[PDB]
Amino acid sequence: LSTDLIKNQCVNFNFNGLTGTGVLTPSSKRFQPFQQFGRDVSDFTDSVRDPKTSEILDISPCAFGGVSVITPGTNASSEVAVL
Amino acid sequence: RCTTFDDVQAPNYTQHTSSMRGVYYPDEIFRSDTLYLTQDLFLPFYSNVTGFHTINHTFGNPVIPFKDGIYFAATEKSNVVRGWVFGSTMNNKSQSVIIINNSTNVVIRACNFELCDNPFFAVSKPMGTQTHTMIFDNAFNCTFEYISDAFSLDVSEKSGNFKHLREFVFKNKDGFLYVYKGYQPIDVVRDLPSGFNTLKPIFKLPLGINITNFRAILTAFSPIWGTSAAAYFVGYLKPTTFMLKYDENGTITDAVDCSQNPLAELKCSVKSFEIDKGIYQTSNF
Ligand SMILES: *[C@@H]1O[C@H](CO)[C@@H](O[C@@H]2O[C@H](CO)[C@@H](O[C@@H]3O[C@H](CO)[C@@H](O)[C@H](O)[C@@H]3O)[C@H](O)[C@H]2NC(C)=O)[C@H](O)[C@H]1NC(C)=O
Ligand SMILES: *[C@@H]1O[C@H](CO)[C@@H](O)[C@H](O)[C@H]1NC(C)=O
Ligand SMILES: *[C@@H]1O[C@H](CO)[C@@H](O)[C@H](O)[C@H]1NC(C)=O
């Protein structure tokens, strides 16, 4: 079943019906005995409870953003730095 | 063994108020520090609550319609309300499910029961234990069976205040029967008081049967029959819009109807419990 634990790496998890990708990490949210998973102020399933160990974990987004290139110009140099 | 009673008073249909009860956890999903709209079956605030009182010569449990899903409350000190039959025809012609507490187990059983017209437990009033299980005469084509853990329940008749307030909601959707539970301690004589308690889901039972009516299974206290003071309260649900309030500990702390007045419906739109002065726009007429 490969019910392992990979913390702090972007993986593509699949719980008991809970699919998706992201970086996994331990949570500290106050559940109930009948909670299974929680959601944020948005409509994303944020936190998760282990079907195997009943551990409260929260799910973070993997990685994204924009790229901006920094140049001093062509007639002087050619090296650049990123952001 | 089907035993009907001799001198039962006709039912009261005495109406009471629904003030702020009927709150349940709608799902299994955690939220916190938030407000949240729902469109689901609910008891509206401050509504007609039919109180069926079991008093000295009054044994009220007729055939009661489930029509849309029901709200139930039980004002208890001696555990008179112990079970229910759910179904449509309330005979052995259609499948009936019976969920009882027989003072040993929570027993769930769905068969074609030959319904006794008067379901009750008989309890010896000077002895203090259950004597009879006069529920059903026959049972066949049993679809579902459940018997819970063995536990010792308080059966004998008590005196004084109603101490125990058990609130139940039953909800047929997608072939299930959603079963809701909640309890608070009380102390009152009659007339189910105001309060605010979120009910908790306990069972989502794949029955798949036509349930239109029901009848509670009460407990006769006998020195054939005799009764003691107990009351149970009839509530229908209606598809409403409420808004919940989650704290930092994920507790439902406040609820608000969007339908009782233009005031609270505005509070559903503005999404705060407090609004200062001014004029605000809501939907069309
Ligand atoms: C959410 O729930 C938790 C737990 O129910 C609340 O935290 C609790 O806060 C109380 C008082 O603020 C703490 O009680 C204190 O305990 C110490 C040590 O026993 C005692 O000396 C004090 O006199 C007082 O009784 C309690 O320990 C604490 N529990 C935990 C687990 O933190 C919390 O306040 C709740 N938050 C909200 C927003 O409802
Ligand atoms: C390079 O171009 C900049 C303007 O983009 C100018 O100010 C600078 O004098 C130029 N340098 C040379 C060596 O042409
Ligand atoms: C039902 O409730 C309404 C208030 O919504 C009240 O005016 C009416 O008298 C109640 N009916 C009975 C039979 O008590």
CATH number, domain containing residue B239: 2.60.120.960
**Residue B18 Cα, ligand 3 centroid: separation in angstroms?**
11
Q: From its phi and psi, is residue B57 left (phi > 0), alpha (psi between -120 and 50) or beta?
A: alpha
Backbone angles phi, psi at B112, to 5 degrees: -100, 85
A29, A35, A47 member nearest B28 (Cβ): A35
Which contacts of B149-155 are long-range, i.e. CB under 8 A and separated by 24 or more positions?
Answer: B149/B105, B150/B104, B150/B105, B151/B104, B151/B105, B152/B103, B152/B104, B153/B79, B153/B101, B153/B103, B153/B104, B154/B78, B154/B79, B155/B78, B155/B79, B155/B103, B155/B123, B155/B128, B155/B129, B155/B130
**C-alpha span between B45 and B270 (Å, rounded):** 20
In a domain, B31, yes or no: yes
In a domain, B1, yes or no: no
Residue B104 DSSP one-character state: S
In a domain, B155, yes or no: yes
In a domain, B35, yes or no: yes
Q: Does residue B219 contact residue B121 with C-beta atoms inside 8 Å? A: yes
Ligand 2: which atom is nearest the Cα of residue A73? 5
User: By the CB < 8 Å criterion, does A35 face chain B?
Assistant: yes
B25, B248, B250 member nearest A31 (Cβ): B250
User: By the CB < 8 Å criterion, does B250 face chain A?
Assistant: yes
In a domain, B151, yes or no: yes
**C-alpha span between A64 and A59 (Å, rounded):** 15
Q: Does residue B73 contact residue B237 with C-beta atoms inside 8 Å? A: no
Sign of the alpha-carbon torsion through B37, B182, B233, B188: negative
Closest of B270, B258, B260 to residue B280, by C-alpha: B270
Residue with tokens 């799902």: B27
In a domain, B6, yes or no: no
Ligand 1: which atom is nearest the Cα of residue B248? 38
Q: Does residue B165 contact residue B34 with C-beta atoms inside 8 Å? A: no
**C-alpha span between B186 and B76 (Å, rounded):** 9
The residue range of the domain holding B29 is 14-280
First to last CA, chain B: 58
**If residue B39 lies in a helix (H) or strand (E), which one and from where to where?**
strand B34-42
**C-alpha span between B13 and A81 (Å, rounded):** 81
Strand B230-236 to B70-76 pairing: antiparallel
Closest of B140, B144, B75 to residue B108, by C-alpha: B144
Report residue B70 as tokens. 């029901």
Rg of chain B, C-alpha, whole Å: 20
The side-by-side arrangement of strands in the sheet containing B29-30 is: A10-11, A22-26, A56-60, A45-49, A37-39, B29-30
Give the resolution value in Å: 4.4
In a domain, B94, yes or no: yes
Measured in angstroms, the CA of A46 and the nearest CA of chain B are apart by: 9
**C-alpha span between B94 and B20 (Å, rounded):** 36
Residue with tokens 């030959």: B114
Measured in angstroms, the CA of B151 and the nearest CA of chain A are apart by: 22
In a domain, B140, yes or no: yes
Side-chain-side CA neighbours of B284 within 13 Å: the count stands at: 0
B30·A34 Cβ contact <8 A: no
B28·A41 Cβ contact <8 A: no
Number of domains in chain B: 1
Q: From its phi and psi, is residue B143 left (phi > 0), alpha (psi between -120 and 50) or beta?
A: alpha
